[PDB]
């Protein structure tokens, strides 16, 4: 029993990560058969920060000005394009430790693992979400960008995120590994602020579950509601609508308990009322929406 | 910015993780050099299980009941060898992803990463304490047994702690490497609890250098106290007591932002006695106590290894 927010074991990654720099800039690219992947802002210098034209700064390079050093090897750059915000060099050398591997974007609300990397070195590894406004809640420091957060399953290693900046409000700011922005930002240093961001309804729902399972049923009532009305009042509490989707996602922890999904829906409304009393669920004392539906079963059932 | 628990990287353990099988018991193995480390209650029946007698148990035994497994690959054992409560297998092949690594025991209040398994496959990596009543508060189903913990510096990892069992409260128990149990259980199937908790103090205050570092301040506040007058509080609330040492310790914190340990624990003095009013300490109702002053110092400045 136990429940813990769970990271997925990083060995896989930690031997794809290597330290990349162009002139003064250094930070951590991933290399993966004869490809490294880096954000593209390693390019761009203290001048032209507000508004870098990455397409005329990129002509202007040659493979020699990117420093590639895997370990204690330097690595030979032998080509180099632009996808999007995500830089790709070619290398000579193929990593001989490219794991199983596939690229995907996920949506808000989804986990993943981080690897923290500086200089191309691993410092640790913790377990996060999207968040609705298309940030992270990271914890990230100066030389820090080019870390990417992954999932594992079975042996493949799918990577979702790229770290490239933070923001004025002190939350996190990425990409998908073909350089797609999640959310409405840009690598520019212009200001930008994240939108009001929410809590994730579903993976509440789907915490609450995972307590019944693990014995806790404090906060269980009598009542069921309407989704509409459900979603009117989770609203107010700056929650995340409560799709059909949602609804379906939680069929299997709702069997395995006996708790309709619109049950423990009502119960989720009495507790944002009334609080938690002093009580704590698994642990907290604030209703925690860093589990998913899927990491419930994987960690409980 | 920002701040997480962090565990640490696990490449270099997950190197060393095996199967190993007798009868119908599987659970999870440490393969280093030539030898392969588990519990030793993987010997263990449903009749002995209340009542065992491991040295009995363990010369009847041959080396052909123990099915080691690497992977898809099979190692053979070829001697076997019981030290307190781990079994040590010899295998005629020695690991060739073996660390350079060291066995430590740790104290309690003292942090490390657990790398949870199942079956020998690794499976999660999430970062505890070692309670004051010797107990992790940590998150393991069937077959996880024989999962280890470990810290690592520079290049070096320090295995300190392997997973026994479970008991009654969902806790778990478990041993050094040497196979000595942290607290006072035993490896049978008998009545145990854990003791009465208690929340370690000089975390919380490594924690809240750790907020103010991040700019939380809300907490702090004009006043300075004793040592001697916050352990009196401290013990009202089931708080481990302060020691001269704790403060110390804290003291590059002190340094780095200003406030004073005694400043500071009359900050938490006044949260003791007045709670949160309503309001949280980085994303958190409660007090975190799982953050060594150690911990906060690497995240805040960026250690890798
Ligand atoms: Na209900
Ligand atoms: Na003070």
């Not at 040659?62 to 330097?74: D, I, M, R």
Request: charged share 15%; hydrophobic share 35%.
């Amino acid at each position: 029993s136990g429940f813990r927010k769970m990271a997925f074991p990083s060995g896989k990654v930690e031997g794809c990560m290597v330290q990349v720099t162009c002139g003064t800039t250094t930070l951590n690219g991933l290399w993966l058969d004869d490809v490294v992947y880096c954000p593209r802002h390693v390019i761009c210098t203290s001048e032209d920060m507000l508004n870098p034209n990455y397409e005329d700064l990129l002509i202007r390079k040659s493979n020699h000005n990117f420093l590639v050093q895997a370990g204690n090897v330097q690595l030979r750059v032998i080509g180099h394009s632009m996808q999007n915000c995500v830089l790709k060099l070619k290398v000579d050398t193929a990593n001989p430790k490219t794991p199983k591997y596939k690229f995907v974007r996920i949506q808000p609300g989804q986990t993943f693992s981080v690897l923290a990397c500086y200089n191309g070195s691993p410092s640790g590894v913790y377990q996060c979400a999207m968040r609705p406004n298309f940030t992270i809640k990271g914890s990230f420091l100066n030389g820090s960008c080019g870390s990417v957060g992954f999932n594992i399953d079975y042996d493949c290693v799918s990577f979702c995120y790229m770290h490239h900046m933070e923001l004025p409000t002190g939350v996190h700011a990425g990409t998908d590994l073909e350089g797609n922005f999640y959310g409405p930002f840009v690598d520019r240093q212009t200001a930008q602020a994240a939108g009001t961001d929410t809590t994730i309804t579903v993976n509440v729902l789907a915490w609450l579950y995972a307590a019944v399972i693990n014995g806790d049923r404090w906060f269980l009532n009598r009542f069921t509601t309407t989704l509409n009305d459900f979603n009117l009042v989770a609203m107010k509490y700056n929650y995340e609508p409560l799709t059909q989707d949602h609804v379906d996602i939680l069929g299997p922890l709702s069997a395995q308990t006996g708790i309709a999904v619109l049950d423990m829906c009502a119960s989720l409304k009495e507790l944002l009322q009334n609080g938690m009393n002093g009580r704590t669920i698994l642990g907290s004392a604030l209703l925690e929406d860093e589990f998913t539906p899927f990491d419930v079963v994987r960690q409980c059932s």
